[PDB]
Amino acid sequence: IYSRLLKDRIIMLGSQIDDNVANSIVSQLLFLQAQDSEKDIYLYINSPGGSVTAGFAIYDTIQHIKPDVQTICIGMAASMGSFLLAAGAKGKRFALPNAEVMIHQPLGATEIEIAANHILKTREKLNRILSERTGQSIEKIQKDTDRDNFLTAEEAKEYGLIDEVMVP
Amino acid sequence: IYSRLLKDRIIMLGSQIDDNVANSIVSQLLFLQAQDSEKDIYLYINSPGGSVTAGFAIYDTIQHIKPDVQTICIGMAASMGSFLLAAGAKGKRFALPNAEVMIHQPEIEIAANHILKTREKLNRILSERTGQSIEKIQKDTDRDNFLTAEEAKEYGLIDEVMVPE
Amino acid sequence: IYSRLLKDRIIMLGSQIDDNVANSIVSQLLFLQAQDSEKDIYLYINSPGGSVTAGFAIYDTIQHIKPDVQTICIGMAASMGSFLLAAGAKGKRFALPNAEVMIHQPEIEIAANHILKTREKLNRILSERTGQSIEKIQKDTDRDNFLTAEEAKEYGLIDEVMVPE
Amino acid sequence: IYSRLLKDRIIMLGSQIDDNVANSIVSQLLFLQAQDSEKDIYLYINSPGGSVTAGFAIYDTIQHIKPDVQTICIGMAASMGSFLLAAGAKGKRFALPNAEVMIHQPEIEIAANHILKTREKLNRILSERTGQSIEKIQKDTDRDNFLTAEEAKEYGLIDEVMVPE
Amino acid sequence: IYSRLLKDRIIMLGSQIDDNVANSIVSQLLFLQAQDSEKDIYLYINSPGGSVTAGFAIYDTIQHIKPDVQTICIGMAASMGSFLLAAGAKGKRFALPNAEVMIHQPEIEIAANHILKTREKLNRILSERTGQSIEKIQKDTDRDNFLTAEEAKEYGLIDEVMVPE
Amino acid sequence: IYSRLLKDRIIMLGSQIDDNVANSIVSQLLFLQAQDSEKDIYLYINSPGGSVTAGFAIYDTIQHIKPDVQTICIGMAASMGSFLLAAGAKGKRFALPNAEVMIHQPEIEIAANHILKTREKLNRILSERTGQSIEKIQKDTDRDNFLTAEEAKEYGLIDEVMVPE
Amino acid sequence: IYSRLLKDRIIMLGSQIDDNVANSIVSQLLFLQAQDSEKDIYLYINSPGGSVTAGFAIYDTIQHIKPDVQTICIGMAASMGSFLLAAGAKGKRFALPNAEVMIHQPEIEIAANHILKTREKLNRILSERTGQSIEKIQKDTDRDNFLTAEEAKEYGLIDEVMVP
Amino acid sequence: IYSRLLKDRIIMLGSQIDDNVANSIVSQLLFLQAQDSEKDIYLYINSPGGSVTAGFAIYDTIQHIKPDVQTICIGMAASMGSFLLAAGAKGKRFALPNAEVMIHQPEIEIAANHILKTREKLNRILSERTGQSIEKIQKDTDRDNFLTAEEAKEYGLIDEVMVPE
Amino acid sequence: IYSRLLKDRIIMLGSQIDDNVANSIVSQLLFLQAQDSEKDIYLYINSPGGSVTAGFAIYDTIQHIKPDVQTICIGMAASMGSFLLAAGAKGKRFALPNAEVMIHQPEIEIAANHILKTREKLNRILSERTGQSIEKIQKDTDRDNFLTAEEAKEYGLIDEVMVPE
Amino acid sequence: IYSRLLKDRIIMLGSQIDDNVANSIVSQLLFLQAQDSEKDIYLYINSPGGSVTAGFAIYDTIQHIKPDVQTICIGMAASMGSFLLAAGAKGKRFALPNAEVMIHQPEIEIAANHILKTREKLNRILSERTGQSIEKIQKDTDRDNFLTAEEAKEYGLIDEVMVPE
Amino acid sequence: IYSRLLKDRIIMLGSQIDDNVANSIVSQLLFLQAQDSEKDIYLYINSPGGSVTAGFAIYDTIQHIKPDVQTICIGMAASMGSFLLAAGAKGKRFALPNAEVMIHQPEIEIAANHILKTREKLNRILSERTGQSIEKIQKDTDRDNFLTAEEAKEYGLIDEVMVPE
Amino acid sequence: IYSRLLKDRIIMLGSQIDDNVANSIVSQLLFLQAQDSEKDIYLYINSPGGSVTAGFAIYDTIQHIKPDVQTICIGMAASMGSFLLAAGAKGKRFALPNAEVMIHQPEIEIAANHILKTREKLNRILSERTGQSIEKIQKDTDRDNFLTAEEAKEYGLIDEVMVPE
């Protein structure tokens, strides 16, 4: 059922992000480029978020591929999911009227897990990448990513997450 | 089994709405759009209701897709369930004669707003599609009350109670 | 295993009726309509009975679908179970010789009404399909009594007790 | 594992009879009818016995299906277990040499009748299929007695004790 | 895990024999018959022993199936365990060198007979398959004695003690 | 979790040996034979020791299977535990450097023999596989003594103490 | 729950060490070897300490497996607990800043030897991996003393106290 | 704790009536008789009700002892609970104002009689002590109905509803 | 609590009879003999019944002591319970009006005798004290039947049903 | 532990009210009456609330005993919990400053009455002891609302909020 | 309670014999010697039997004390229980009519001797006091057999079966 | 009970020796010295043995008191139990004929010494009082061996095995 969608180059990120899900989408991202490098990819996102490392793997492949990947936020986008929303092609990042976006990044388990992310400083990268595309200063990013809050669709547009709010 | 129904453009919504179901619904809607963007989509509803955020993802995608989506309530539809019933394409939102419809509710500086602000966004979107005045909707979604099929018609949730044939 | 029966248009109702089963029934009915909207549907029933709201969803969908649905009781059918037996397509509602049939029951300003109002809606819909007068039905669904296959025929639940062949 | 036996039209009845098992039996019988309505069905029986109502649902469906059903007792068969043994298609009801067979029993104005009336309906249906006179059956199902394979043959439960080959 | 052994026609009997195990054995035997009715069945035995009636159901089904069943004792086999060992297909009943074999026992007008009559039926069926005279078997099953693999061969329980290779 | 090791032909023996474990070991051995009858089987051992009869069933099956079984002691191995260590395929029986090995013991006309006769059968089978003379083994299994890995090599239990790499 | 950590090659050692735990550890180590014999294994340690013999089975298997095993102490590690900490793959043996480390002890012709001989085998194997001289180790494992993370580094138990 | 009440001739009946409680009651009654055979015994009752046979043992011993026994209902008293309330010494049987009282029910040739015959013996013994006519009692103990303290007085269960002071 | 009754020469028998109770009874009987060897002993009985051997120890000691022992049944007395009731000192064996009385039952060369021989010794000792003929007793202790107080008097178990006073 | 408090005439009510607790409360009240019928009883209350019938048994016994009972709320008191708070001896019913108080709710011909009739009996008995008019009480017990200590004083539940000292 | 019997020189042996009981017996024997070294000691016995070593301590002390000790069996006496019965002072060892008597049994170089040597010391000491020849005793203590009171007299365990008076 | 024996200067040592018992012994010894410092003290011993340190406190106090202390073994005396037997006043240390006697055993720089040094102090103090040479005692206390009364006499533990009289 995803396949017939895959044939139209529509990819769905629908759940918590783990390596299994990441691997699947990366496989789908490559598969679409092999089908055509020119045509757009529709990436629909409803996720709470998930593992940070698996996020980059999805992020990098979206960056590495030639095709334009649009992101469209449906439902709730949070953690890595929200991160992949702002990571879409510029001008192509949309959200439906009612979606809620939370850019908070949870710290998480064993510290060693922390050992790499802090070592990873993904937040810095996460803050760095998010700051560049959203246009906000790194400091402001650092603060919000540390806080629990929920932006509406519109509030995510002014803040720089989504370029548009799609009307019915 | 569901595919054979899906091939005929019927979508069953059968249980409390979580991220798993909502996703599975959304994917089917975008599917049935990719199949044929003209013929309408029959969406049955029997639910106790479900998580709010997972509800909108079904709501918005109903609006965002081109085809008409006929919500047909059967049996209980409550909480975010009915809110999908009332979200159907106008004129096509049905119920079966014996079914019942019902409506109700599911750092603190921020959390207290998010719980309130989330509810008005339900109170509004029902005020359009029922046509009732918010001062009534504001009151109804608060208190639990059981609307029979007919009393829902008068209320503005369902347009036509489907009579057997 | 069930599919192979489903392919032959037989639907087993095997246990107390919850949202899980009722859904699985409904989906199969709308299925067997999508397959062929002419040939009748054999619906077996063996149940202790189940939740009310989940029962209607099976009831209404029997009415709402085009084909005829032959309810065949085997073994005990009680509470909302029999109420589906008596809901079959007229003339086709059967029982096997040794089976038994039985019928009975499952803020306070609102709750007291909803419990009463829900029951009349059972008392009515049995009054049509048994043909008995509500003053009798009003009394029967209250007290527990065990109707053999034959005594059900006389009573109006089942039309034809199926004799072995 | 059972399917591979089911594909060869063998049905194991392995434990005390509840609604879960009885259903699973019934579904398999109606299945093996849908597969082939000619070839007979081998039904093995090893049981301590089970709930009465769940027994009939196996009994009636044996009668209601077209094919012949060969009940083969192995090991103990007692209470509602044997009553299925004696319910097999005449001439085919077997036992293995060493197996044992046994027979026995499991508002008050109504309850006292239902407990009595349910038992005669066992006393009758054994009187046909054993051929014994009810005045004997009336007595046997009351007292616990252990019938060896042979003594069952003389008694009329099993037609042919299967000798090893 | 067991299936992969079952696919190779090996059946482990691992614990005291109840209705649950005996059933699971029987179903596997009738299975391995349905697979291939020619190739023999390896049946390992390690048991303290089990319920009598559940034992026969394994015994009779060994006799009733067509293929040869090679009982291979490993470790202790006692009470109804050995009685299955001695029930293997003649010439194929084995033991491993260090294993041990042992044999022994588990209204009153009726109960006193059933306890006696059940035991002779063990005393007989061992008298055939060991070849010993009942006056000896009558005595052995009474008293507890530990037969090594070899002493079992001399005794007639096992034909060939399997030597390692 | 164990399966993934089992797939690589490793078998953990982790606790005192009862019928439950011994069975689970045996089934795995006959399994790994059915998979591949060539490649050797790694059998780790960490045990305080266990029931005698349940030990042999592991012993005999090691002998009875075709593949080589490498017993690798880690941590304490005592009583019937070591007796499996010393039962490995010759030349492959290992230990890790720091592990310890130890050996010792667990109508009256009959019982006094069975307790003695069971022990010689341990004294013998260690006399082969250690190579020591029974007059020494007869003495060692009586008194409790703690053999380090090396002192076991000199003793004949383990062939090669595995050094880290 | 642990599997999901196990899939990422982390092994929690959470309580006093008995045969049940030690076995469960060993099986996981041989597992993570069967999965991938290259990538190192993170082994966390929080323990009051446990039975001696069950400790070695964890020790030896750390040595016997190919991959590197990084022992990370968190919270108290004492008795046979620390002895696993000090048994990690050299250079990778860590501690968190606030954790504490500690070391100490648990026919008569034979029994008196086995209790002594078992302890030297602890005194030796710590003398290699701490680098301290046995005459010091011989003394330390006798008396109870609480080594903070840093004082353990100086002592030779842990190589690098992990800073947040 | 209870003894100090027992010393003052108060007996609490606190839970469903089993053999354990009934015994403990009986022993206390015969006790309080042995202490003083003149002064009356206060017997409180709060019960959902209990086993029939264990009830009589409390009933009969109330009759068999010399002193007067004042049954004081507090909270629910139902099934065999009330039947003790109505069994108090005439004129002294009380209730507190808000308490509720209720009455209802708990080989086949013999069993069907014993279940009927046991109930009449309740229907009779209530007919004396309530004074109502059996044709009414015969009907009341069948159907579940909730008698408030006062409505019990009118009914004849309790003589004097105790008003607070 | 019991002592105060014991001081008044009352002995409660309250539960199924095990070695613990029987001992506690015996010790009390020999006690009440040591106190006063003249005044009779009141022995109440409410029991489901108990182990046979532990029953005799109460029986024999009733016979062996000098004083008269008045067995007073209250509530159910069955199995070895009634057998103590019928064992009271002749003329003093009572029952209360509503109580019920009932009677029934609880190497193989030896075991089959011991189970039979133990029962006749009950059949005999009831034949004396009821006065009934063994051919009747032989039949009664086999089948379960519920004797009311009066029907026991006619039967010979109890001499005088105690009427309330 | 509680006894030492009980000796000082303090009674803790600590959890949701079932038959077990209510009984344990009642027994303690009748106890503290038997100790001294003059000195008042301190009754603390911290509860989420409990079963209705088990509540009255605490209510009535407060009224029925002679001494004054000072209800002291601490922490949440809700449902039948507060209804005991408001049931204290007038003038002594307290609360601590930070505690919260709250009030709300827990054949069909009969059942619908019993659920209604049971609630008025709560609505009444609060109308006396709060002094509020039933038309207000009728409304308050329906909707959930959180009354702080003070707002309860104004409301009439508690007389004096106890200030720390 | 026991003291009052002890004051009359009766000693109850009521349960399986452990160190706790045996001690309590011994202390009582040496006591009753210190009281009066002339009058005989009544020792009742009802036991399933107990630990061997704890038995002798009762045996030897019977011999070592001056007074005569009359063992009176009541109910079952088995294993080390009877061995005390047969250890009474000659001529005084009794039984009650219905009681039953029975006799049977409870490093390896040493352990095998200690288990044998301990038993002969029972076989001997019964050979004196029964008078039977060891070749018979050697056989009897091995096999379980139930000796009635009389058959014990003939056997030499008890001198006089006490008849009721 | 013990006092009455204590008054006659008998002291029972009945169980494994802990601080509680040892204290209770010591206090009694110093007592019986305070009573009369001339007459000897009978000390019975039946023990499995006990804690070492608690043993000496009994040993030393035997030596430290003036009177002679006659240790009389009855039944098993082992571990620190016998070591008290052998500690009696020379010439008076007895045993009863059937009793058995046995002897055996119960920072590391310090702990290894304390366990060794504590044992020699047992090996010595037995070497005096048995008279055996330490090279024998050194060996005996190591291995478990069961000394009958006589074999103890030859060994030097007991002087005179007391024969019955």
Side-chain angles (χ1 to χ4, degrees), chain D residues 5 10-11 16 24 26 32 39 42 48 57 60-61 63 72 75 82 84 86 93 105 122 124 131 146 150 153:
Chain D
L5 274 70
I10 297 172
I11 291 175
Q16 70 287 0
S24 178
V26 170
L32 295 181
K39 296 174 182 177
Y42 303 142
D60 292 345
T61 298
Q63 308 310 104
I72 299 171
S82 70
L84 294 179
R93 304 174 304 184
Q105 70 285 0
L122 293 174
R124 181 175 66 252
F146 293 93
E150 292 179 351
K153 183 178 180 179

Side-chain angles (χ1 to χ4, degrees), chain I residues 56 59 78-88 90 93 101-105 118-142 147 155-158, chain K residues 98:
Chain I
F56 287 157
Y59 175 83
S79 178
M80 192 63 69
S82 70
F83 181 83
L84 294 179
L85 178 63
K90 290 178 176 294
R93 304 174 304 184
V101 179
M102 179 174 72
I103 54 175
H104 68 282
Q105 70 285 0
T118 300
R119 189 168 189 168
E120 292 179 351
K121 180 167 68 179
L122 293 174
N123 283 334
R124 181 175 66 252
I125 297 173
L126 285 175
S127 182
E128 279 76 351
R129 295 183 178 277
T130 51
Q132 299 293 320
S133 62
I134 289 173
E135 293 86 0
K136 184 179 175 62
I137 291 302
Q138 189 71 60
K139 185 184 294 178
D140 279 341
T141 63
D142 189 5
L147 272 61
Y155 192 90
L157 293 168
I158 58 173
Chain K
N98 296 130

Side-chain angles (χ1 to χ4, degrees), chain D residues 11-13 25 41-45 58 62 69-72:
Chain D
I11 291 175
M12 293 299 297
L13 182 63
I25 297 300
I41 293 172
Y42 303 142
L43 175 65
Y44 289 91
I45 289 174
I58 295 171
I62 284 176
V69 174
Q70 308 183 347
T71 62
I72 299 171

